Symmetry: C5
Subunit: 232 residues, 5 copies
């Protein structure tokens, strides 16, 4: 198989005055004198694809005439999963009412470590409020590296303003993001019927979120396994 001098997206394409198309791939600049390669290189650059420069000399500023396009490159793609039995999960948590989302996250991580035992790694991403979750989830989904995304928050009616608009927007936005990027997004954003901060609700919801974390961990594991199964 031919040597891969550099693989990655074209950082910049420069058509020099000597009929050479200089393209920078994976931090290394390569140029080609082929007339047919110039429109192909331009199309590759404008399509957001990753090309692999192939030549006998892999040094900077070396000519090349061999290149491979697997399937419209990689670009922002190559996501929607990492590997079976070894993947990663992103846990986005809001910092409003942190003392309960913390319990949910601790239960989730503990259960995942108990079952998988190191096969699954969970990364924690902090976020100011429930409204900021859909965009963060979209970014983490398009970046790849993740087989599932979990978002946790505690949306509370404070008795002054109405809270249902933000909850509806967040739920619908998470659904839209997961449909757009084809990465599962599990919802642990919960809106109680009543919460008047009487320390009885405070004691109750700690344990209830402790249970919800384990439930979400099991759901995430099973959905990732099933999605990997039906793709074969």
């Amino acid at each position: 198989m031919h040597a891969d001098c550099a693989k990655g997206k074209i950082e910049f394409s420069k058509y020099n005055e000597d009929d050479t198309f200089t393209v920078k791939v994976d931090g290394k600049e390569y140029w080609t004198s082929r007339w047919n390669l110039q429109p192909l290189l331009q199309s590759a650059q404008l399509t957001g694809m990753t090309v692999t420069i192939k030549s006998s000399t892999c040094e900077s500023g070396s000519g090349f005439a061999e290149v491979q396009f697997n399937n419209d490159g990689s670009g922002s793609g190559s996501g929607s999963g990492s590997l079976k039995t070894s993947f990663k999960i992103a846990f986005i948590q809001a910092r409003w009412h942190a003392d309960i989302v913390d319990e949910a996250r601790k239960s989730f991580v503990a259960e995942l470590a108990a079952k998988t035992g190191g096969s699954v790694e969970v990364e924690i991403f902090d976020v100011p409020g429930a409204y900021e979750i859909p965009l963060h989830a979209k970014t983490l989904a398009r970046t790849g590296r993740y087989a599932a995304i979990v978002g946790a928050a505690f949306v509370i009616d404070g008795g002054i303003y109405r809270h249902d608009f933000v909850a509806t927007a967040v739920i619908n936005g998470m659904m839209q993001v997961q449909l757009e990027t084809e990465v599962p997004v599990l919802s642990v954003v919960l809106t109680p019927h009543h919460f008047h901060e009487s320390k009885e609700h405070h004691d109750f919801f700690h344990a209830h979120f402790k249970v919800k974390g384990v439930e979400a961990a099991h759901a995430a594991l099973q959905i990732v396994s099933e999605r990997s199964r039906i793709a074969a």
Copy 2:
């Protein structure tokens, strides 16, 4: 038609240094020395289309110059139906309150088998909860092979958290997926007015879901037949 050596999507396109464009179709690598075929092959690869390799020699690494493009290839297309009087249906069921979705599914399958008698086959897909249904439906619709998709769940107000957000998101997402992929999606996700788990509701909803399964089977058959009719 010419001898079809291999038909399928271009797994990878490799432009070698000898002015040859090597493309792998249906697991077999083929190369062209034609200058005009290279931009056409690149466009075919970037457009997500399937080409048909036509040549006298069908062995690996054999050159070819004949290719046929039916209609922008197949790619992710060729779905939205399998065949009249012989097709498949995907039954996505949630595992929350399984004892009732099970009754609905059994009624659906029994009625299907009663009328069609083996003409329609039902494949069964499990899912953690109602929130995971739209993405599974989108995947199964884009994969083709299915003339209709059925999603069943039982969304319950548990008395602690509000449940209407998830139900609204699920219904709207199922409709959006159905409009996006042009594959009918029938909804058997139901939200009762009251359910307090007093075994009276438990005994009632078993039979009611038993009825709903037969109703959904009839609706699926009729809608598939009508959609096949108006397309001629």
Copy 3:
């Protein structure tokens, strides 16, 4: 004006080793030896363009060198209307509570026939339930041939499950479809405040839908006339 051997979408394009983009248009296969025509034919095929093969010989397998592209071909386009003072309307009706949608449809057809007197033709399409209307409307709008689409249903709260989710989904889906395809869609899907099946509601809603049919007929005629007016 040059003779039209065949006009329509390219059924299949076959670039043989002979470097000839053999193309089947309107059920007739035509081939060209022009080098410049091959990329143009490929672009037309991938863009869903309808080409008109023009040559002195219109028989199958005859060479051609003349072709006309009016405006990106026709493809799935040429819809959003048929002709002024002579067009068609699609009436999609649900089969749930058929005894009332029947009254609405009869009123609509009778009023149309009374005013236009044969200038407007109404085609009836059957559908199992309200949830299956938006996709049927999208298909009938994309197929062309129709200046307006009418969808009728009777969404009823049965006292067991909640019904507002499906009604909201249907209304929003019809609006989305009519915005997408630029074909007016008139809504005759109605949700009464109360309906307990006491034969008083049954007697009342027959006449009320009888009125609604005439109202919808007048609205459809007015909107089609106005839309045809502002487009000049």
Copy 4:
């Protein structure tokens, strides 16, 4: 600057057998014998752009070799505004409860004429019901010529059917249209809490809509001025 024989969208492109690409622009047919211009003309036609045919002879059927592409042509573009201090506004009004929308429209027009004094022209468009406003707004926004669009209606709960579905659909559709076409759309569709047709409500809402018309006029003027300001 070179003479403009004809400027507009390519009505039809015809590649004759004499290696000439005949294109009709602004009602005049022009042909070119340049080999390089043919793919460029095809791309211009398929991209929905307007080209300006330039030649020493501007008569029909005259050869040309000069053409200018400003920015992907005009096509459906050139909208989202007409000119500062002199623009147009489209007033779409529903014919349901006309006696109140009439007061709103009269107030709007009178206030516009009082402040601008002929600098702003208001065009009136009639529509059978509130459900048919968003598509009309989308058409009038895509056609250009308008810096703002106003939609007025009176959505009323009649006591028989539920009315909130249509109102929600209309508001969301108007917002979606204004986001899609980048033309401001001001909402004067109003849903009162109670209206039982007791002639007290009828007398009150006349004056209230009279006030709302002036309010909408001021809002439209200020938003158009601000949008024109931030674009420099």
Copy 5:
């Protein structure tokens, strides 16, 4: 590195009769006689990309043969952020109930000046009402120059018409805009449960918006810092 005669979007492309492709970049007109550059220049123009004309002579009407395409140009892109530790924020405020949004804005600006001390600059944009916020936010997001966008309004039930439709539309449209343009948009649009203008509510909501401004300032700083962090 080669001299930059002019960098920017192609204002207009003019293919003269002398086989020269004149392109205006950054207010300066440049022409090239290269046959291969003409399709590349046309593709660059139609793709909405910015090219950098490079030649030994940078004067108007000077020939060039060198050009660089970094990554599909800039065009409407280059947004979603300005720089770390030194960026800008757009504060869109509605003029309905200005005496409270003013308090919110003053708190926001004061807190940002207290912490950053001149590192972050806030620009104030006026808007007639809550309905006009999402489109303004979309414009300011697409123009670039901003790492975050804040929208403030006070949606009030006046006791005559229903207000929840507009609030829902505004929240959903703001979330849709922030997902479309990948620029965070923080919500300070608030809908109180009750507000009867008895000057007790007027005194209370002044201080409450004073608090909400500081809260939004902290949330904006945190979200910008985190988004800049995860992008490395």
